[PDB]
Design a protein around this ligand. Sequence first.
Ligand SMILES: [Zn+2]
Ligand SMILES: [Zn+2]
Lengths: 152, 134, 114, 176, 117, 138, 134
Amino acid sequence: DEITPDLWQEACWIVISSYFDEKGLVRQQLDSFDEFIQMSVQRIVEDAPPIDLQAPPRYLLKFEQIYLSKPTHWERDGAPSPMMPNEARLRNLTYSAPLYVDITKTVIKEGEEQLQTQHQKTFIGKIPIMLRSTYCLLNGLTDRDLCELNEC
Amino acid sequence: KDILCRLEHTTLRKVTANTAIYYDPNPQSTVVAEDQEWVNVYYEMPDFDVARISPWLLRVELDRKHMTDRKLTMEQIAEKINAGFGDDLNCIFNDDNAEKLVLRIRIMNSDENKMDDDVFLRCIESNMLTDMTL
Amino acid sequence: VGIRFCQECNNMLYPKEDKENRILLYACRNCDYQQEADNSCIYVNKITHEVDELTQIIADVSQDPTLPRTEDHPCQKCGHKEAVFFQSHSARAEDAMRLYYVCTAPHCGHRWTE
Amino acid sequence: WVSMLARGGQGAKKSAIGQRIVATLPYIKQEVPIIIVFRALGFVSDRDILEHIIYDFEDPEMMEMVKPSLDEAFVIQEQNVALNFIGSRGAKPGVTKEKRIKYAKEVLQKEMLPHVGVSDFCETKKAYFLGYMVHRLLLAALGRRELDDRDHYGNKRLDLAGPLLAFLFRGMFKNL
Amino acid sequence: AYISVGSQPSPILEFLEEWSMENLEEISPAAIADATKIFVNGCWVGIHKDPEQLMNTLRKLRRQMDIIVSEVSMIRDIREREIRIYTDAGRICRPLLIVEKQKLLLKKRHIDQLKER
Amino acid sequence: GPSSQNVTEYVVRVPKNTTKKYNIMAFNAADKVNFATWNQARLERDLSNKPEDQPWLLRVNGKSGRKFKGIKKGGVTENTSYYIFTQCPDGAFEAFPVHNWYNFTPLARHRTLTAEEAEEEWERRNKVLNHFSIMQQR
Amino acid sequence: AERGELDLTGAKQNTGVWLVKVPKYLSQQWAKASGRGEVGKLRIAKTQGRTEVSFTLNEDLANEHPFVLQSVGGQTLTVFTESSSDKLSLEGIVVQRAECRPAASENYMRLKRLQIEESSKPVRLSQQLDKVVT
Ligand SMILES: [Zn+2]
Ligand SMILES: [Zn+2]
């Protein structure tokens, strides 16, 4: 109907409560990082001009799509394993996610024949991951789950 | 207050309402009737300019309030302009009774008798407004 | 005071006199075009430049929610009671505290100074 | 940068004309008169250039403000001449005129006002925006518009992790 | 306070074209005087002859989250005859309660619904 | 009379393909163009670059008449369309999409200072006197 | 008579044409029909002191478009065609400018929301992998 002044003080702090229940307090950090991973990284790869080689055969390389996996750590024996943030802190690791890109390689041999091969999910490096961001392991974990991971 | 005025710098720009340049080919019917009322009096028996006169005219309107504040007189301004430029320019001003204070300026007759004749008058206008000291 | 461009190459026309006719003319530099001058005034310099601020005011300012509105100054044209007032806030005036009123009635952008 | 020269300089010609507007384009050592930049864009006639700077010719005060700038670039009356003039000050000296004109077009095409456009058909768009910059400068000089405040946070942006990281990633991916 | 993350101005530009906004490449320079310049992310896109209706429409769309996202700034400088639209990242913003006719659009029903968040 | 309450209705036709493409030619209002004087008109592609990706060049009445240079519009009407309605005896309006938009600006025909010569005038940066006399020498 | 010469017969006939901007859906529907022979009817109603122009979409095509006129004094628009035979011709001179606007106020935005969604369909964004690529 309408909020009377006798109830405004409660009403306004119900509004403020819902804002923080949703946004939190580091939303600017997490939202900015999520946009960079979700959009900027893909845009930067898409905007890159295709690599043209000519020196005769002509080779073209195009980076199609970006993939990001969970923050992973590799043991000295080569076995991958998910990297918990607490393990990174204790073992002085960098909390990073492997970055993969789809690359299409088309070669023109001047014989009027075109051969196209795609190298799906080519490893191109590791991106440090902001904690509790959409691409962090802690994302979408209930408070009980976080405690099981020795995370506050 | 007399000492105050004698010290505070006063250039033409301070007491000048506006400056306009007209071609003014015929001095008699100079621009409009307002100048016609008093311009003729100077031209009924004119001196030092009957020989010739520059075509271009520089008309200066002087604010009454600013002139009164500094107690400046039109004759003094004409003498000051005459002193600064000597005979290079001819200055004609109306009487103080008229509600509008005007001061027509032209260039020497001898030159009329190389840059330009309108641009140069523009240079004098800026030169008089700022550099010239009243 | 006015500004003209030659009809030939649409460049700035500058004043010039002809000795033979002793009549003001406007001549284009890069064009050689000439035109008869009708204003007779090369230029006017306004030191005081007491430009009527009412001309500079835009009637759309009545739609500004942050401007104050007064019902004590009815519009002189349409008689609408509500009007919006504000100060010039224009540089080179050297002094500005007077209020400029604009009628709030739509389609009546009347502006005045008390 | 589009700048209006100060009136401090004293001269019969300088004082009479007034203050002239110059443009500091990127990759150019020295200030370029504004009207030359408009000529290099493809607008030669004074009416055309003023139509992009002054949107109301009925206003005489603003018209007199650009007159000193028109006289400064009166020598240059062709687009190619204007392009050569800008190229003469280019990042690297031009061995021949053809290289100078090509270099000047390159700077204007992409290095000047890139956000307006970076294509070869964006000259009209850049002329309007560059005229808006000159128009904005005239309003400030005429006192009709207040000078902008650097401390205003409307005129500020905060670079967070994303834009920060994206800036790094563009360089690294180019290296890759 | 919230810092805008940024979004593409394409949906806003397309809507402006669909709306009665004259493109900058099609108009004559004489028409710019009366009309209001439309800036999107600092790029002068065109001019509009009915700024008041356009701003109301833009505000309505952003409030309904139809074409304009929440973090998009629509500024009308009435004196300067300019409408500036901003969509880029780094803009600091804060949530404010909307008031229409000296009345908060926030009513008791919203508070009751929030109480059972 | 009938004009006070006249009502007119016409059909709209959209032919699939037309042998001739439709373009838009625009001139500045201040240019004061006059089609009556257009006894002859020649439209050819410019040669400055040295085809479809280059500006146009319009010449009217040969050298004697005004010369205009056309430039393709940078903006792309991806979310907009332009059509032309032409009156026909059948009375059914016909709409033809515009292939491109071109803006034509007049070109001056007078002795223009050469780039090499403009360098000489550059020494007179601001010491230039009697701007009128500059073109007299040329 | 030359290849570069432009035909001016249309201009000499004082041919008048109208320039109208239309939305994408109206053009898309016309494109969808592929030019069957009819896409709608334009209705013009003139009163004692006002004129009303509107367009009606074909009922078959769908399975009102009021027209707002604009002043032409701001520009001189003429239409020229480039025939496939390399014979440029001037169709005529634009005599009126109009704009087409939709009738729906709010429900139209739903179509735009889908259109924006369609425009953003090919906008690729990074994907998350459950397992590290091996
Ligand atoms: Zn000329
Ligand atoms: Zn009123």
